[PDB]
């Protein structure tokens with residue numbers, strides 16, 4: 203199994219053409235502020251293949 | 252003027268350069284008071300759930316459903332939405348909802364998913380691989396589990412075939428494992444397909460009871476009736492804003508009106524199909540819509556060869572909302588609009604540069 | 618609990634003139650002192666309306682129903698295609714206090730009637746989908762228009778005090794919208810419901826057709842006159 207390839211899964215908004223995003227910050231899916239703490243309604247935006 | 256005329260010299264006269272309009276300030280939305288909520292409380296807060304092989308089925312239609320409180324509440328151990336993201340349920344909606352509720356073990360939580368196999372997934376409840384909806388699961392050890400054993404709940408383990416998607420089998424017939432016939436009496440090759448859950452308060456995590464409810468949303472060609480509330484806000488007056496009154500969108504300034512809408516109309520139009528009055532769905536009062544002001548602008552100049560100072564005329568615009576030429580010089584309000592950069596005199600001469608309504612200007616200043 | 622009666626309900630199927638009745642508001646838009654032309658389903662002017670003095674009648678596109686009712690003998694209506702459990706059936710009843718609308722696969726008897734001493738004209742009621750309860754609908758001319766377009770069931774109603782003896786009066790009165798149903802059923806036939814004591818009812822039925830009309834709106838937004846654009850050259 204190859205897992206060197208990862209893709210984004212969550213974003214605040216869409217992407218303008220020919221842009222690049224490499225930042226890896228926790229995603230505040232719910233109303234609860236994650237404040238950099240992983241948990242409920244907080245998920246890693248990068249998913250492997 | 253030079254740019255529009257595309258020249259570096261301008262002769263004496265009046266020229267039309269551009270337009271002018273009042274921009275909207277903010278937005279407002281109006282919608283009815285919102286009522287007839289879907290009864291999720293009687294489902295999730297039900298005192299007693301049914302067994303997994305006899306899962307309770309409930310039909311939901313013709314109500315407003317708020318999934319925001321369900322998503323925000325952390326009391327649910329497992330919250331798995333497959334068809335769509337939970338945040339988008341409040342926006343679009345389907346024609347009906349089906350809720351299937353039961354109680355299972357804590358380890359069998361992942362069996363209730365598309366493309367899953369197991370005793371529950373093949374003998375009690377089955378989900379199609381194309382199923383759309385959500386699944387909610389939460390521990391109920393303090394309630395469902397009994398110190399003497401919650402033997403009431405049963406699970407099916409034995410059947411020749413599997414269970415179809417959204418298919419329930421509750422047959423209590425003695426399963427015949429072998430080819431030896433049985434006269435309703437369990438023997439070597441005959442057994443009861445149903446066995447009892449053995450929940451206790453001290454059994455360990457994984458064996459504790461878990462209440463599980465799956466929600467499936469269906470979109471038959473009948474009109475949709477169940478989805479989230481429509482947000483609203485207050486309303487303002489005497490200011491050009493844009494509005495979304497009950498699905499009717501448009502810009503303008505809203506004032507009070509004295510028209511008498513007959514008790515079942517919603518909005519009124521006069522002629523050429525242009526809306527003039529609306530009724531807000533909450534206060535139930537008749538308002539009036541007026542397009543906020545606009546018009547063309549013009550410049551009066553005596554010629555570049557003579558001087559370099561000009562005057563500006565706004566056509567058909569009241570001298571109340573003009574806005575560097577906001578104050579400038581003395582402002583004159585005339586039947587043709589408003590004029591800035593020239594002085595009004597009490598004399599009367601011949602007409603040099605026509606302006607309108609019997610008045611015109613000339614260079615002396617202007 | 619439903620049994621076929623002995624005597625036949627052979628009502629004389631007479632014909633009479635519609636005159637200028639059967640006009641309803643086509644939308645919910647307020648207009649003041651204006652002439653507006655619209656194309657929709659209407660009852661043609663001076664048409665031939667059927668008079669019954671309880672058969673299954675076709676529904677077609679829409680139905681105009683009228684009754685010079687006395688002491689509230691008519692009670693409700695039944696709508697469907699096969700009129701059994703094989704297809705969804707609509708039922709409307711106006712009892713003493715409320716009106717009840719149900720959408721279920723009933724099993725109606727061969728001669729439904731409400732009976733007196735609530736609903737017992739059906740042997741069974743299964744797979745119910747839609748329910749609704751509201752205020753009562755009802756010398757007393759009751760006019761109703763029933764339409765079914767793209768899964769929407771529209772009911773328009775009007776009540777009038779009359780003093781004429783026998784037939785429909787010569788006059789104009791628009792029908793205001795009453796009720797909307799967001800349910801999809803391909804209704805093709807219907808039936809009338811009577812509550813006759815266990816021991817002489819007249820109404821009028823007409824059909825709608827697509828055509829163009831011209832309507833006049835007065836200052837207060839009420840329809841006071843109309844013209845049929847396909848009756849005679851002067852109207853055109």
Ligand SMILES: *[C@@H]1O[C@H](CO)[C@@H](O[C@@H]2O[C@H](CO)[C@@H](O)[C@H](O)[C@H]2NC(C)=O)[C@H](O)[C@H]1NC(C)=O
Nearest residue numbers: 290291292293294295296297320321323324326
């Ligand atoms: C089941 O009942 C509980 C208890 O009444 C509900 O939890 C309450 O929810 C309201 C609305 O969010 C809160 O204001 C209360 O503080 C909650 N009480 C407790 C003790 O948590 C719960 O919402 C009900 N479930 C459903 C589906 O209606």
Ligand SMILES: *[C@@H]1O[C@H](CO)[C@@H](O[C@@H]2O[C@H](CO)[C@@H](O)[C@H](O)[C@H]2NC(C)=O)[C@H](O)[C@H]1NC(C)=O
Nearest residue numbers: 282283284285286483530531532533534535536
């Ligand atoms: C929608 O809800 C609002 C708020 O509950 C209702 O406004 C109330 O109307 C009554 C009747 O005049 C007043 O006594 C209250 O003071 C009003 N409350 C507020 C907050 O304004 C309104 O009547 C409702 N409208 C409909 C059609 O249901």
Ligand SMILES: *[C@@H]1O[C@H](CO)[C@@H](O[C@@H]2O[C@H](CO)[C@@H](O)[C@H](O)[C@H]2NC(C)=O)[C@H](O)[C@H]1NC(C)=O
Nearest residue numbers: 567568569570571572583584585586587588589
């Ligand atoms: C420009 O707007 C002002 C503000 O409304 C107008 O002043 C109004 O004039 C009418 C007619 O005399 C009065 O009845 C109002 O009381 C005035 N309003 C105010 C706030 O003073 C003015 O007339 C408008 N300009 C023109 C040319 O009509």
Ligand SMILES: *[C@@H]1O[C@H](CO)[C@@H](O[C@@H]2O[C@H](CO)[C@@H](O)[C@H](O)[C@H]2NC(C)=O)[C@H](O)[C@H]1NC(C)=O
Nearest residue numbers: 710711712713714715716717735736749750751
């Ligand atoms: C007329 O119809 C109404 C509507 O069904 C009846 O009122 C209901 O009666 C049932 C009978 O058990 C009650 O369960 C409901 O709670 C009642 N609802 C309401 C809104 O009242 C009424 O009883 C009927 N009257 C007669 C004389 O048959």
Ligand SMILES: *[C@@H]1O[C@H](CO)[C@@H](O[C@@H]2O[C@H](CO)[C@@H](O)[C@H](O)[C@H]2NC(C)=O)[C@H](O)[C@H]1NC(C)=O
Nearest residue numbers: 310347469471702703704705722743744745746
């Ligand atoms: C009993 O009710 C169910 C559910 O209301 C009906 O199931 C529908 O069956 C049709 C037939 O293809 C499907 O297209 C629908 O999606 C089903 N669900 C609905 C309408 O919600 C069932 O047909 C009803 N039984 C009878 C005899 O009409």
Ligand SMILES: *[C@@H]1O[C@H](CO)[C@@H](O[C@@H]2O[C@H](CO)[C@@H](O)[C@H](O)[C@H]2NC(C)=O)[C@H](O)[C@H]1NC(C)=O
Nearest residue numbers: 509510511512650834835836837838839840841
């Ligand atoms: C249309 O509306 C006007 C205004 O409400 C009605 O005029 C009133 O008529 C009543 C008669 O019942 C008089 O008592 C009032 O004095 C009238 N007021 C005014 C301001 O005219 C009118 O009757 C309504 N109908 C028609 C056909 O015009």
Ligand SMILES: *[C@@H]1O[C@H](CO)[C@@H](O)[C@H](O)[C@H]1NC(C)=O
Nearest residue numbers: 260263553554555556557558
């Ligand atoms: C226009 O310009 C010429 C030369 O630039 C000058 O002689 C003439 O007087 C000017 N005309 C005016 C100022 O009206």
Ligand SMILES: *[C@@H]1O[C@H](CO)[C@@H](O)[C@H](O)[C@H]1NC(C)=O
Nearest residue numbers: 581583593594595596597598
């Ligand atoms: C002269 O014009 C001003 C306004 O520019 C006015 O107030 C004044 O009354 C006028 N005087 C006469 C004598 O007309």
Ligand SMILES: *[C@@H]1O[C@H](CO)[C@@H](O)[C@H](O)[C@H]1NC(C)=O
Nearest residue numbers: 631632633634663664665666
């Ligand atoms: C209405 O139908 C009856 C039944 O045939 C007929 O006698 C009568 O002339 C018709 N009226 C018309 C066509 O105006």
Ligand SMILES: *[C@@H]1O[C@H](CO)[C@@H](O)[C@H](O)[C@H]1NC(C)=O
Nearest residue numbers: 472698768800801802803804
């Ligand atoms: C009614 O029947 C027609 C013809 O069989 C069909 O086209 C239509 O979809 C049906 N409408 C329903 C079942 O609501």
